[PDB]
Write a protein that binds this DNA or RNA. Structure first.
Lengths: 203, 202, 154, 31, 101
RNA sequence: AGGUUGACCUCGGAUCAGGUAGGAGGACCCGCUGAACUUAAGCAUAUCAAUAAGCGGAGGAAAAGAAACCAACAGGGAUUGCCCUAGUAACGGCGAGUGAAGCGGCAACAGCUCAAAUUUGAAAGCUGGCUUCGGCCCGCGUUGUAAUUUGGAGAGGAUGCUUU
RNA sequence: AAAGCUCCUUCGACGAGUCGAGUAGUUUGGGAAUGCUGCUCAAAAUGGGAGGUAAAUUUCUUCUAAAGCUAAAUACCGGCCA
């Protein structure tokens, strides 16, 4: 299983520039942080659940918050990308739980936000006052607003009187019955339709 | 206004009025030169939706191209290699006749930029196209933020590099599973898939 | 020049603290521009429509008689887009429309509308549905006349 | 042949309105 | 939306959540008829008339050969669904002409 | 004066006023065109290879790019690149061989402009010339130049606070 | 003067020889499921595309093509400096 039948020597990529590229990336990050100070170096991201049945046990960071999440948090969609919040217009909220989690995330960020006035001599009422502008800040939203609990807890404890009775017949029999019903959903519907037609014909 | 009606009427290409207009205009454009300047677009709604404006610096050039397949210019139309099980009458050009028309109009007006083009007519011998061009040196163009992106040097000869609409279609730049080989660039994707990557700590 | 003088008067009125409508009256002008006139016909604001007979491409105005007939607007086909351009201070004009006139010309407008209805639309009511063209050349016409004469003689 | 700085910095009226009322703000986030 | 069963297999399977009702996205309005578009298409149909293959299908439908009309429309357009929609539209045109005459 | 005097449309001329392209370079980049040696016992499918050579076109990067996407989940969410997916799904004379993608971790992240609407109580737009730098003219343009809207919406209303 | 937020009876235009179909050549892992191009036919309005086995019927899920712009992370046997 050796794929060396093409002119492979023309397209060999070595990586001797790995430490140099790491140094260049760190220099670029330092320059971006110095240019963006006192703002954090990154944008606030929502918590999303990974697709497919393999990865839906785990949550991670998404692209941006939804318009519904911004509306429920009270943050206008034009103000949001100017105060460090990422916006994603494609994503929708199919269920209430993720919507509530991301709305609470936005409200925590809004409670921790310090908003400097556009003009120092003319502050507005949406702006943070000068007596509150001084506080210990964070510069990594991926760290301070990360995924705290990416998986469910793998172990809890309950009293022995709170042990559930379980599904009737057993979980194995419940799984077998669910698979059988899914396989026979159409045949039983056709049989019921034929029986109803026969009953209507010979009532 | 009237351009909605023009679009709905241009959909009906087999109606009597559109067939008559196509016939007389095909005769007239066959009488004219192979590449010639049009004073105004013959399909104003199509030109407007492709981006034409009635502004100093937008021009329309009409061009006819010979239709059909492509011939390999080998002596006597026959190859001297391994048998191909096909004739030169069945070779297909990977670009469109629209793209060939845009290239020839760009060479005719090398001072301008090709914005887009559209079909206007065809017969058995020729397909007929109208190409919209923009003058990047006209100050009415240069002052307009909707169009002055075309004044930058990276947009020199988009029709030659396949950056027009027909070029994007021919290069297959669409998202998804049907365009796996081409969506990032076919030769670039091939080079990425055929590069042997060796790390230091391997 | 008239617009500049009107804007000067309105600017003076604003300077002395009056609205521009205090010194500017309601205008009554010929409506022009193809999209503008088409929208006026669709909203039935146009009282009379004049369509130029020499529009190239003809698709711009080919639907306009049918639109005016569906919306009940009196129309007439007239000779000269340049003639309409002289009306609207342009080189050419594809279509013009009268929506409203002044009260001293309302009777003239009604008379012109009735004259158009009685002397153009009723006269072209049947000929507008007929096919045009199909005319032979001079030599072909003479050849066919000679052939018909020979067939009648023999 | 490069575009002049004024022509390169020209913006549309809608973009100008959006930049006038929602520019990039200075801000900090507490920890 | 129907509540999921909480199981990994079977009908209505999957993890239970409280499904919301979304206001419909404006990108999904495509295909809806509008008054202006209906008006313009009606006027353009009146001005331009019919295609020759449409006249052929109308003649077949007037003669009553519906299977002929569907087969010829599939040959002309390409797909069975487009042929069916075209045959229904031309039957509506024939019915409107009959109720007018 | 009307056998005249003009208005437009199309098409021309000028060493007319002001501009622009060509060639070089081509390591990398975007396309077109396109082999054979080789490997298959030989050999017209195949492989080498959608490679070399040939032709056109760019930049400091280029290209791609804000879903007519992936998915089938408790759903993700523009593009690019690395790691993995994976020598896997799949394709393949007489078999030599060929071979992706979604998810997942990371690097980096940024979003938008038109056409389809009547400003219609006022083409509100723009090239050029002359300027006393206040403007004034020749024009383009209604077969549509500004403002407004782009599907995440928007338009019309209602409503009361904020913004520059 | 312009702009944002909240609510609503209503309205809500959305790209055609294009999509798609057949056929031929080429290409692809997609020689049942790929893309491109030529010729012929040639659309629609909850329409249209996709949902990797052909078709009819009934559902469902996702987007919204046929116009356009855009930094970074990526490449670099050319040039310049180290």
């Amino acid at each position: 299983n050796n794929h060396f039948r093409k002119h492979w020597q023309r397209r060999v990529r070595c990586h001797f520039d790995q430490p140099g590229k790491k140094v260049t990336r760190r220099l670029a990050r330092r320059a971006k942080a110095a240019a963006l100070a006192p703002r954090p170096v990154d944008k606030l991201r929502p918590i999303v659940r990974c697709p497919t049945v393999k990865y839906n046990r785990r949550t991670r960071l998404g692209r941006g918050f939804t318009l519904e999440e911004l509306k429920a948090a009270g943050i206008p969609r034009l103000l949001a990308p100017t105060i460090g919040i990422a916006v994603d217009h494609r994503r929708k909220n199919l269920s209430e739980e993720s919507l509530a989690a991301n709305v609470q995330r936005l409200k925590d960020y809004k409670a921790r936000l310090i908003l400097f006035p556009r003009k120092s001599n003319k502050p507005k009422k949406a702006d943070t006052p000068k007596d509150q502008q001084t506080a210990e800040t964070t510069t990594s939203l991926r760290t301070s607003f990360g995924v705290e609990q990416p998986l469910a807890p793998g172990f809890t404890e309950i009293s022995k009187s709170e042990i559930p009775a379980g599904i009737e017949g057993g979980a194995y029999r419940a799984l077998r019955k669910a698979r059988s019903d899914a396989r026979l959903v159409g045949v039983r519907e056709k049989r019921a339709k034929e029986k109803a037609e026969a009953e209507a014909n010979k009532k | 206004g009237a351009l909605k009606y023009l679009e709905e009427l241009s959909k009906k290409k087999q109606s009597d009025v559109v067939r008559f207009l196509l016939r007389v205009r095909c005769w007239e454009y066959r009488q004219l030169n192979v590449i010639h300047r049009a004073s105004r677009p013959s399909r104003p709604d199509k030109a407007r939706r492709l981006g034409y404006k009635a502004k100093q610096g937008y021009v329309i050039y009409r061009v006819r191209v010979r239709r059909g397949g492509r011939k390999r210019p080998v002596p006597k139309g026959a190859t001297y290699g391994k048998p191909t099980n096909q004739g030169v009458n069945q070779l297909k050009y990977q670009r469109s006749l629209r793209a060939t028309a845009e290239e020839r109009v760009g060479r005719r007006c090398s001072n301008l930029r090709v914005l887009n083009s559209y079909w206007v007519n065809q017969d058995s011998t020729y397909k007929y196209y109208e190409v919209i061009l923009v003058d990047p040196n006209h100050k009415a163009i240069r002052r307009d933020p909707r169009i002055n992106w075309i004044c930058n040097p990276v947009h020199k000869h988009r029709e030659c590099r396949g950056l027009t609409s027909t070029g994007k279609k021919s290069r297959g730049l669409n998202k998804g599973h049907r365009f796996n080989k081409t969506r990032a660039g076919r030769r670039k994707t091939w080079k990425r898939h055929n590069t042997l990557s060796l790390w230091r700590y391997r | 020049q008239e617009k500049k003088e009107r804007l000067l008067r309105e600017a003076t009125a604003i300077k002395e603290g009056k609205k521009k409508e205090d010194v500017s009256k309601k205008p009554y002008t010929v409506k022009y521009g193809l999209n503008h006139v088409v929208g006026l016909i669709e909203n039935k604001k146009a009282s009379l429509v004049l369509i130029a007979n020499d529009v190239d491409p003809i698709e711009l105005v080919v639907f306009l008689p049918a639109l005016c007939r569906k919306m009940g607007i009196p129309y007439a086909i007239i000779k000269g887009k340049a003639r309409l351009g002289t009306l609207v201070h342009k080189k050419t004009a594809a279509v013009v429309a009268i929506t409203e006139v002044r009260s001293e010309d309302k009777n003239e407008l009604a008379k012109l509308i009735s004259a158009v209805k009685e002397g153009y639309l009723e006269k072209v009511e049947d000929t507008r549905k007929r096919w045009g063209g199909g005319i032979m050349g001079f030599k072909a016409q003479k050849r066919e006349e000679k052939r018909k004469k020979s067939l009648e003689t023999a | 042949r490069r575009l002049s700085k004024e022509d390169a910095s020209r913006v549309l009226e809608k973009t100008k309105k959006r930049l006038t009322h929602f520019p990039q703000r200075k801000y900090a986030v507490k920890a | 939306p129907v509540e999921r069963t909480g199981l990994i297999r079977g009908l209505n399977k999957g993890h239970k959540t409280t499904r919301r009702v979304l206001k419909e996205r404006p990108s999904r309005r495509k295909g809806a008829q509008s008054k202006r578009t209906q008006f313009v298409r009606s006027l353009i149909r009146e001005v331009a008339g019919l295609a020759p293959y449409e006249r052929r299908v109308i003649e077949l439908l007037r003669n009553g050969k519906d299977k002929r009309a569907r087969k010829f429309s599939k040959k002309k357009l390409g797909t069975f669904g487009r042929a069916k929609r075209k045959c229904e539209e031309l039957q509506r045109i024939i019915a409107e002409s009959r109720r007018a005459h």
